[PDB]
Amino acid sequence: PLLTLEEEVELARKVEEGMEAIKKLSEITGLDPDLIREVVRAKILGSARVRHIPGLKETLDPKTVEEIDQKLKSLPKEHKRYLHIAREGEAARQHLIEANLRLVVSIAKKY
Amino acid sequence: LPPGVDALVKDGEEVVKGQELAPGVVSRLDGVALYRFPRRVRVEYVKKERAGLRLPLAAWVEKEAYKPGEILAELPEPYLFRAEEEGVVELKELEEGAFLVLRREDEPVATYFLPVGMTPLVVHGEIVEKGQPLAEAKGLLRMPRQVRAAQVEAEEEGETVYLTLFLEWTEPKDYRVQPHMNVVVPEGARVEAGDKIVAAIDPEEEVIAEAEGVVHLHEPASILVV
DNA sequence: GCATCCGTGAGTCGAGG
DNA sequence: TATAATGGGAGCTGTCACGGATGC
RNA sequence: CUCGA
């Protein structure tokens, strides 16, 4: 279904704050923002889609994403908060794209 | 949900299939209802004060405390509650009943409590002298439903009793939420001074809690049953 | 056990354009 | 890189016999 | 496609 202004703004906000949260998690963990993003995305999507990302220095397999997920879950509450922020960020991302798949058609039909 | 129409169910509560969610909405499934974008946030701020009231001794009913709606006294004839101080009148009417404050200069000099069945005979900003009638109590008089009497002190003088009531109640304040704003506080949560209720794009449009109170969400944009 | 829809064959060579 | 934009658009159909899933 | 055998 097509988004209302409120739903749209909400999702966009969740995405932005999610990215900021990934940045903060990179600050704390000392890890790579890209790696963290890929782990969060992996957990949100599921075991079905776990492939190696070109830019990553480490091959993205369920083992590594589990190690990183356990390195994330082992954080203090106020630090572990950003993880939840990030997860909901990715979810909002998926929903935002999927909600805006019609516009692409309406434009593409002219090319 | 249509504009300006409030929900019949509350946020977080279980739902049955077919059970109406609102005057125009019937839930097809069973589960947990959730509020989607509450457009009006009502905050019940907690107020604990100490007010006074003089009554005929015969009409009064002796109690150590008073629950809401409970009878405070019964007058056989119309009684005139009089000011025992001089000053300007600040009339603060609640849903039912009122708080009448007398002040000289900036400083408050008196604080009287008018229970239900006590028509105030003064307006806001009025100057009164001592002995002047502030309110007429006719027939039975009871505690308002929104205010409760925690403690009661009684001072016998002449053929009257003077009650120092330690009252506690809540006062509501509504806030209209705009689509670009987001409520960062759940239903029935307790806030203090300085705590944010609704966030916004720009700091000057944020909703910060003035004093201590509880949060209530009304008029959701829609309701998500899950 | 019998009608219905689908996929597939349907000559050779030669010439022009 | 920022007004807002949110589900396409082709489409004449004059044969025939078989193996087939089917599917009536 | 049209022509030829």
In which residue are the tokens 């516009």 written?
Answer: A103
Whether A4 sits with its Cβ under 7 A from any strand D atom: the answer reads no
Residues A39, A70: contact at Cβ < 8 Å? no
B112 CA, D19 C1': Å apart: 102
CA B210 to chain centre: 16
- The pair of three-digit structure tokens given for residue B177, joined into one six-digit string: 């939420």
- The pair of three-digit structure tokens given for residue A21, joined into one six-digit string: 């949260």
Residues B19, B42: contact at Cβ < 8 Å? no
A103: left (phi over 0), alpha (psi -120 to 50) or beta: alpha
Residue B78's CB: how many other CB atoms inside 10 A? 10
A58 is in an annotated binding site: yes
Residues B191, B215: contact at Cβ < 8 Å? yes
The span from the CA of A54 to the CA of A58, in Å, is 9
Residue B4's CB: how many other CB atoms inside 10 A? 8
DSSP summary character for residue B100: E
Please choose, from the candidates B80, B72, B77, B75, the residue with its C-alpha nearest in 3D space to the C-alpha of residue B58: B75
Asked if B200 has any chain A CB less than 8 Å from its own CB, the reply is: no
Residue A99, CA: closest nucleotide via C1'?
A: D6
Residue A68's CB: how many other CB atoms inside 10 A? 22
Looking at the 3D structure of chain A, how many domains does it have? 1
Q: Which amino acid is at A79?
A: H
Residue A101, CA: closest nucleotide via C1'?
A: D6
Residue B207's CB: how many other CB atoms inside 10 A? 20
Please choose, from the candidates B224, B226, B203, the residue with its C-alpha nearest in 3D space to the C-alpha of residue B22: B224
Please report the resolution in angstroms.
Answer: 2.5
How were these coordinates obtained?
A: X-ray
Across-strand partners of B154?
B163
DSSP summary character for residue B112: E
Asked if A101 has any chain B CB less than 8 Å from its own CB, the reply is: no
Residue A3, CA: closest nucleotide via C1'?
A: D6
Sorted by sequence, the CB contacts under 8 Å of residue B130 that are 6+ apart come out as B82, B83, B84, B85, B86
β B160-176/B31-56 pair status: antiparallel
Enumerate long-range contacts of A92-100, CB under 8 Å, 24 or more apart.
A92/A10, A92/A11, A92/A12, A92/A14, A92/A15, A92/A18, A93/A11, A93/A15, A93/A18, A94/A44, A95/A11, A96/A3, A96/A8, A96/A11, A96/A12, A96/A15, A99/A1, A99/A2, A99/A3, A99/A7, A99/A8, A99/A11, A100/A3
The span from the CA of B198 to the CA of B181, in Å, is 7
Range of the domain at A33: 1-111
**Chain A CB contacts of B37 below 8 Å:** 6, 10
Residues 87-106 of chain B whose Cβ lies under 8 A from any Cβ of chain A: none
Whether A48 sits with its Cβ under 7 A from any strand D atom: the answer reads no
Across-strand partners of B54?
B162
The span from the CA of A96 to the CA of B3, in Å, is 25
Q: What is the CATH number of the domain that holds A87?
A: 1.20.120.1810
Whether A8 sits with its Cβ under 7 A from any strand D atom: the answer reads yes
Among candidates B36, B179, B182 on the partner chain, residue whose Cβ is nearest the Cβ of A5: B179
B/e letters for B191-200, b = 16+ CB within 10 Å, e = fewer, are beeebebbbe
Q: How many helices (H) and strands (E) does chain A have?
A: 5, 0
Strands (E), B87-192: 87-93, 98-104, 107-114, 116-120, 127-128, 133-142, 147-157, 160-176, 182-183, 190-191
Residues A88, A19: contact at Cβ < 8 Å? no
Q: Which amino acid is at A20?
A: E
Among candidates B36, B180, B222 on the partner chain, residue whose Cβ is nearest the Cβ of A9: B180
The span from the CA of B155 to the CA of B161, in Å, is 5
**Nucleotides of D strand lying within 7 Å of any protein CB atom:** 5-9
DSSP summary character for residue A40: H
Q: Could you write out the DSSP letters of every residue in A46-81?
A: -TT-----TT-SS---HHHHHHHHHHHHTS-HHHHH
Residues A72, A15: contact at Cβ < 8 Å? no
Whether A105 sits with its Cβ under 7 A from any strand D atom: the answer reads yes
Reduce the DSSP state of residue B196 to 3 states and report it: strand
Reduce the DSSP state of residue A91 to 3 states and report it: helix
Q: Is B132 exposed, middle or buried (0-12, 13-18, 19+ CB in 10 A)?
A: middle
Please choose, from the candidates A30, A37, A33, the residue with its C-alpha nearest in 3D space to the C-alpha of residue A86: A37
Q: Which amino acid is at B204?
A: E
Q: Which amino acid is at B136?
A: E
